[PDB]
Scaffold this active site. Structure first.
Site, PDB file in Angstrom:
ATOM      1  N   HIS B 112     -39.712  17.194 -47.017  1.00 10.97           N
ATOM      2  CA  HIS B 112     -40.045  15.901 -47.600  1.00 10.97           C
ATOM      3  C   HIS B 112     -41.312  15.965 -48.455  1.00 10.97           C
ATOM      4  O   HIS B 112     -41.708  14.957 -49.046  1.00 10.97           O
ATOM      5  CB  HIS B 112     -40.258  14.859 -46.493  1.00 10.97           C
ATOM      6  CG  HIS B 112     -38.996  14.408 -45.822  1.00 10.97           C
ATOM      7  ND1 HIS B 112     -38.486  15.052 -44.718  1.00 10.97           N
ATOM      8  CD2 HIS B 112     -38.156  13.377 -46.076  1.00 10.97           C
ATOM      9  CE1 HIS B 112     -37.370  14.458 -44.331  1.00 10.97           C
ATOM     10  NE2 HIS B 112     -37.159  13.429 -45.130  1.00 10.97           N
ATOM     11  N   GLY B 113     -41.964  17.124 -48.536  1.00 10.00           N
ATOM     12  CA  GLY B 113     -43.307  17.180 -49.076  1.00 10.00           C
ATOM     13  C   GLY B 113     -43.423  16.925 -50.566  1.00 10.00           C
ATOM     14  O   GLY B 113     -44.554  16.801 -51.052  1.00 10.00           O
TER      15      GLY B 113
END
Lengths: 178, 178
Positions: B112-113
């Site tokens: 998700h970064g």
């Protein structure tokens, strides 16, 4: 006081939904005389959360797979970053939101919940608000992000956070009644 | 094998990061001779999470507010839906990533970064992968989303999920060495 007797709203949730983002609107809607059903990806129970801690489990009335929007006058999209990130990719949740748009049925969304709307292809050209983390995603998707306690575009009703819930409830009730 | 001796990597995390997406790469870089600093928005400790449960606490080496990219050869952006959603709005974290782009320094991002890169305006014209839930956000922001174990676009190294970490580590080491 506005009656919603005879109205049925579908709340679309997966595990990790913000609990008050379902129970607050659910109680306000039920108080006005409506029925609220809980739809989830799987049958059984779906787990709500209070911020970053798991909270209570709720009985799933039906699945997205089995649902027909003929049976509902509107959709409620609670947030919860975890639920919102999960649900947005589910084709049947997207289909329910798409069918609501085609049928001019209200969609009430709050906090992180608009990711489903982005991924369903439904925010382009629409005005809505959200938790500010989603602002870039909504604007990049073609939405018109505004900072309002309750935004309205047609029958799209949007709010940003749990504190907005009372005004959200009041506006959703006005829009459902028509 | 490849020595990274003398290199220093800043991992940018907030509470709710995916613990293995920090610890896995950190060990690999350290085994290669590099130094890994944990930077957060607040001093003290930063809470890693294991999927949907908070896990171990990690010492914060420095805050985004105090950090200079002069002292780092690359950024590591572990995921976690809670962390990635929080960190994307922090201007000081965005600044560190923009400085990385301007100085042609590697950025390794996972799961998700990449939300932070979206909000920093850094995914435009870039090819990268991610957890599939971000596909639409990456594409809507002008990126080219791909489904790879490790994607590389210049010095931007991206993976999708914890199972990609071994390959993510190996690619990061290669890109860092140059």
């Amino acid at each position: 006081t506005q009656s919603l007797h005879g109205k049925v709203v579908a709340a679309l949730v997966t595990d990790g939904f913000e609990q008050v983002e379902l129970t607050g609107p659910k109680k306000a809607l039920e108080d006005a005389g409506a029925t609220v059903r809980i739809l989830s990806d799987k049958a059984g129970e779906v787990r709500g959360w209070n911020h970053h801690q798991p909270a209570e489990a709720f009985r799933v009335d039906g699945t997205f797979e089995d649902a027909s929007l003929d049976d509902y006058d509107a959709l409620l999209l609670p947030g919860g970053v975890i639920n919102s990130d999960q649900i947005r990719s589910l084709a049947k949740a997207q289909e329910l939101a798409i069918r609501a748009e085609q049928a001019s049925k209200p969609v009430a969304v709050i906090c992180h919940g608009a990711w489903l709307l982005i991924s369903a292809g439904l925010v382009q050209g629409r005005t809505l608000t959200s938790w500010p983390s989603l602002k870039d995603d909504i604007n990049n998707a073609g939405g018109h992000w505004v900072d309002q306690e309750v935004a309205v575009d047609g029958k799209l009703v949007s709010s940003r956070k749990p504190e907005d819930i009372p005004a959200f409830n009041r506006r959703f009730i006005e829009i459902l009644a028509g």
